[PDB]
Design a binder for this molecule. Structure first.
Ligand SMILES: O=C(Nc1nc(-c2ccncc2)cs1)c1ccccc1F
Ligand SMILES: O=C(Nc1nc(-c2ccncc2)cs1)c1ccccc1F
Lengths: 392, 388
């Protein structure tokens, strides 16, 4: 490569939104550095003290100029988790309305889990799919990570199911939209591993978008993923993701198809197929699914609906989807006279949200520990350098 | 406004004088990786995961950015406690420069001024800085090569007739005025700092002792700075109570430079180093000229005009009184057009890499905890954000 080439490859790396060394990523590195060094114990070191003094006024200017949490007026808290909360926000200046997901830095290190958010960030920021909730901005500070997404006023499928005894025609639509959405994620080289109605959001038109990609992972050369992670609510998780708690096994995308079948069973039956009072009881039923899977006597569920569920609720080796989406798509359950796969999101959804305003939260039910002072360099902000992201 | 905030923030990453431009930011991340990558520190998971996450990335950057291996070293032209200076050929561009290496370790045991002056003087009187870069061990300053060598070399191989001394003194006066105009006092003007270009014209290099003057063009410095034979009496006495001095201290050195060119020795030479300091202090009585019918009336006057106490020293009331001096009265050059004239010694060079005018020629321990040795050097890079 020529000197000019070398200069421009480097220049374009500072401008790339997908670059690990983008001006915002680099700015994080400096912001972290200042945060993790500014303590009386550490300032004893002159290299450290002079650096902080040199970058004092500068770092403050930057901190104020860059996107901060105070740029958003919080309209309502729409969701809440261990990590932190999800909230309907209005950007004070642009007066634009978004949904913002806050993740506690202390609560992530405390819990040891610090890497999921990278996948959630990447997926939402770069999917460029009608099936994925869009990330417009990602920013941070010493306490939280912030993800500014598009607001999905239709609420989640949990809310839909809780208000309706779903007819088969609706379930067919929602399952189809999910299959399409998951295929989109799979095409990006990702497996979700915990697909549930909580992750299924509805836009202003009643169409599906997947959100909350916290359990997402990039597939290896073989479209597989290993995992030494613990399970949180097994109800929708595949037997293989449970079978591999400790990294004792790789699994492919067919694990998400299992969750699809569960989603269908729940929409038509009214309960999940492996529910048990205790959490461990659910895990047992999932494991024993060959015998634990039963359908109620009311011949309400059609032949093809019962078949698709069982096609998905089997061991991976014989599970529908093992040979790609097309065998799922070809299933007779999806045989209809309302929509075509290639034009489904352009059709009229079964439940169209009637909204009062850009800030209507009717489809959402109504609903702080700090790091200690370091006695030596601990670098609490380092696992988050490069999380900042802006759109142009 | 949102768009103002975005703009202010964007203009800061582009500014060559900004503390947070691409150069500085890339320097920080590079410093962070360097100061953390040790087995003792990698015991910390926050630290180890960060390094692992940025491994391939940091290497790509390190390879893409200007590195020392991009230059083929042609010859070591100067050497110093600080480091070495070397004639280099940039392997790709095949372009020839002089590169000044400064040992980071040897410093922790001034370069910001040297960098700024050379990178932004935009003066024919100052050696040009094209690039500045670094690594874990050294700072690198890629400057234009001055093949005419230093005035020390000229003086050592010639007996300088008055007509030549007049030229070189004049070029120095102009060069120092340029530095002064930038708000700096050289504080160590010597023939070692005076380099000659391909045409035989002067350029000042090595601004190691340069200090920015205050509001009233003064400098409060509690410690002596410079070389023993050139140090002014005021910068020699420079202490707690005193400390305060102006640009007239460089004019003292100009007189020393003239005396040496014409006489052949410095005016306060003594066998011992301490003996020189004594003579400097007693400049009123120690300044003598040999029985030399060749040192003119006006040359002797200019020397004494400069080799006096600051209060009555030529230059106290600006350059124009130095310029107006009869010593500079001539029919060869005008001050305005002087660097456009033909120099008294025009270098006869064999190639772009001729080094004939140049005489022939450990780091930090491994940290047991975070010490941040690369932090005092974040921003030194002059590559991604330069003035054009
Ligand atoms: O992560 C979560 N929810 C999410 N909701 C949105 C969203 C909401 C509305 N409009 C666009 C996007 C994105 S992620 C979550 C997880 C566990 C517990 C509570 C939670 F709220
Ligand atoms: O700093 C020093 N020399 C310098 N030489 C140049 C230069 C040389 C050639 N062409 C352009 C520029 C720049 S600075 C020095 C000081 C003390 C001891 C040895 C040294 F080499």
């Amino acid at each position: 490569m020529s000197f000019e080439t070398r200069f421009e490859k480097m220049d374009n790396l500072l401008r790339d939104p997908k670059s690990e060394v983008n001006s915002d990523c680099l700015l994080d590195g400096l912001d972290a550095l200042v945060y993790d060094l500014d303590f009386p114990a550490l300032r004893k070191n002159k290299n450290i003290d002079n650096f902080l003094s040199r970058y004092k006024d500068t770092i403050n200017k930057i901190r104020d100029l860059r996107m901060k949490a105070e740029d958003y007026e919080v309209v309502k808290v729409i969701g809440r988790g261990a990590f932190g909360e999800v909230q309907l926000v209005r950007h004070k200046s642009t007066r634009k309305v978004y949904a913002m997901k806050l993740l506690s830095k202390f609560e992530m290190i405390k819990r040891s889990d610090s890497a999921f958010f990278w996948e959630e960030r990447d997926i939402m920021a770069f999917a460029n799919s009608p099936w994925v909730v869009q990330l417009f901005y990602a920013f941070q500070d010493d306490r939280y990570l912030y993800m500014v997404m598009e607001y999905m006023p239709g609420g989640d499928l949990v809310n839909l199911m809780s208000n309706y005894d779903v007819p088969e025609k609706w379930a067919r639509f929602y399952t189809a939209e999910v299959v399409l959405a998951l295929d989109a994620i799979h095409s990006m080289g990702f497996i979700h591993r915990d697909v549930k109605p909580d992750n299924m959001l509805l836009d202003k038109s009643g169409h599906l978008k997947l959100a909350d990609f916290g359990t997402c992972m990039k597939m290896n050369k073989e479209g597989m993923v290993r995992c030494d992670t613990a399970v949180g609510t097994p109800d929708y998780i595949s037997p293989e993701v449970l079978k591999s708690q400790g990294g004792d096994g790789y699994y492919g995308r067919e694990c998400d198809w299992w969750s699809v079948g569960v989603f269908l069973y729940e929409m038509l039956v009214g309960d999940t197929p492996f529910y048990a009072d205790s959490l461990v009881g659910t895990y047992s039923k999932i494991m024993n699914h060959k015998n634990s899977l039963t359908f109620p006597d009311d011949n309400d569920i059609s032949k093809e609906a019962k078949n698709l569920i069982c096609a998905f609720l089997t061991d991976r080796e014989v599970r529908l989807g093992r040979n790609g989406v097309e065998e799922i798509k070809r299933h007779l359950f999806f045989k209809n006279d309302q929509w075509a796969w290639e034009t489904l999101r352009d059709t009229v959804a079964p439940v169209v949200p009637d909204l009062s305003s850009d800030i209507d939260t009717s489809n959402f039910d109504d609903l702080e520990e700090t790091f200690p002072i370091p006695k030596a360099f601990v670098g609490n902000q380092l696992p988050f350098v490069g999380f900042t992201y802006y759109s142009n």
